[PDB]
């Protein structure tokens, strides 16, 4: 089982654990975790966070062959549970969270998109275009202890968490590009 294998003490997550488009797990809606969490579910969240930190560490990223990443969702490991990790570096970190059962509870009418577009660790190609998301979101999630957090995101951090939540709902970033005019800007779309 992917979770039993990845949560072994001796295993460091690397690109070989990340599934790519064509695997149906990326199109499946992931299952809610229950509380209390099992050790495996806690360890999985920790291992995903270690992957992100290793991926942003140039020494470790080089030794492990990693693509640097700011977010990861358990379905990208072939594990269909609603668990995500986000790590956004400050320009230590502007946002660092392991989220269980994350949910958007409120969002702005305004939309937003990264002006550079998006890629994905599960996507081995480039898909240009504005990926249209909500500009601001309020997100509820639980931590490893079962305590509820409610956070407000905007800017780049809002886009990142939205990308990962799309993963646990079976959605890919290019689902949000308008293929007819990928660079179209409707009224109410803020290009970041
Ligand atoms: O599900 C999650 N992923 O697919 C990983 C995405 C998540 C984001 C996609 C856009 C908003 C969320 C992800 O980090 N990138 C995808 C391709 C490259 C890498 C990326 O942009 N790296 C960096 O910014 C980066 C690279 C190195 C160091 C620091 C930052
Ligand atoms: Ni992704």
């Amino acid at each position: 089982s992917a979770i039993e294998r990845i949560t072994k003490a001796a295993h460091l997550i690397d690109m070989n654990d990340i599934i790519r488009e064509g695997n149906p797990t990326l199109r499946t809606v992931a299952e809610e975790v229950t509380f209390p969490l099992s050790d495996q579910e806690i360890i999985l969240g920790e291992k995903m966070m270690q992957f992100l930190k290793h991926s942003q560490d140039p020494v470790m990223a080089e030794k492990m062959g990693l693509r640097g990443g700011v977010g990861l969702a358990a379905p990208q490991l072939d594990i269909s549970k609603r668990i995500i990790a986000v790590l956004v570096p400050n320009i230590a970190y502007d946002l660092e969270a392991i989220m269980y059962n994350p949910k958007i509870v409120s969002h702005s009418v305004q939309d937003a998109a990264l002006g550079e577009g998006e890629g994905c660790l599960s996507v081995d190609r480039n898909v240009p275009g504005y990926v249209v998301r909500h500009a601001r979101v309020t997100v509820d999630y639980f931590d490893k202890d079962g305590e509820k957090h409610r956070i407000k995101l905007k800017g780049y951090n809002s886009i990142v968490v939205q990308h990962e939540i799309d993963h646990i709902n079976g959605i890919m970033f290019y689902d949000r590009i308008n293929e007819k005019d990928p660079f179209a800007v409707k009224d109410g779309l803020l290009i970041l």
Side-chain angles (χ1 to χ4, degrees):
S1 117
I3 199 178
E4 308 183 319
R5 172 182 82 63
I6 287 169
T7 61
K8 276 164 179 162
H11 184 74
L12 300 168
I13 290 186
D14 59 21
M15 305 308 297
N16 288 328
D17 297 311
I18 293 172
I19 63 176
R20 315 294 162 82
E21 4 161 43
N23 187 309
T25 300
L26 291 167
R27 293 299 195 183
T28 302
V29 177
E31 263 225 308
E32 228 168 47
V33 306
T34 67
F35 285 87
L37 301 175
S38 67
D39 297 337
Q40 290 203 340
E41 294 170 319
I42 292 162
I43 287 166
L44 174 60
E46 295 173 340
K47 300 245 183 223
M48 292 170 59
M49 182 59 74
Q50 288 292 297
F51 166 84
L52 295 175
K53 283 182 179 174
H54 284 161
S55 81
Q56 291 180 22
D57 177 355
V59 169
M60 189 64 49
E62 160 265 311
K63 282 163 166 169
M64 300 177 65
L66 306 181
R67 273 184 86 181
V70 296
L72 189 62
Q76 290 181 284
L77 299 172
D78 207 2
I79 293 160
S80 191
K81 300 176 169 280
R82 303 188 80 72
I83 304 174
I84 66 173
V86 286
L87 186 64
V88 178
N90 246 348
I91 306 180
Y93 301 110
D94 197 42
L95 171 61
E96 173 182 350
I98 298 155
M99 294 183 191
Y100 295 86
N101 298 340
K103 187 190 186 43
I104 301 169
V105 296
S106 188
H107 56 88
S108 61
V109 167
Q110 195 173 44
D111 286 345
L114 291 182
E116 258 160 29
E118 295 188 16
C120 184
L121 294 189
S122 292
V123 178
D124 290 312
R125 48 194 184 99
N126 299 331
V127 193
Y130 292 148
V131 181
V132 172
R133 294 189 185 285
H134 309 299
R136 300 184 291 292
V137 286
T138 302
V139 175
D140 284 5
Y141 65 94
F142 298 81
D143 66 24
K144 72 177 62 180
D145 304 303
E147 293 303 330
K148 187 173 156 165
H149 293 271
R150 172 169 291 169
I151 64 168
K152 278 176 169 177
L153 297 150
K154 61 173 141 186
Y156 181 68
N157 291 353
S158 171
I159 302 291
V160 173
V161 168
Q162 281 183 77
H163 183 116
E164 307 310 334
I165 287 183
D166 270 352
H167 281 307
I168 68 173
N169 294 320
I171 296 176
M172 308 293 304
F173 68 94
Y174 51 68
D175 300 349
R176 301 185 179 288
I177 292 170
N178 168 1
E179 358 63 285
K180 303 151 98 302
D181 196 3
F183 296 100
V185 286
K186 271 177 70 219
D187 257 37
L189 174 70
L190 167 71
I191 304 312
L192 301 172

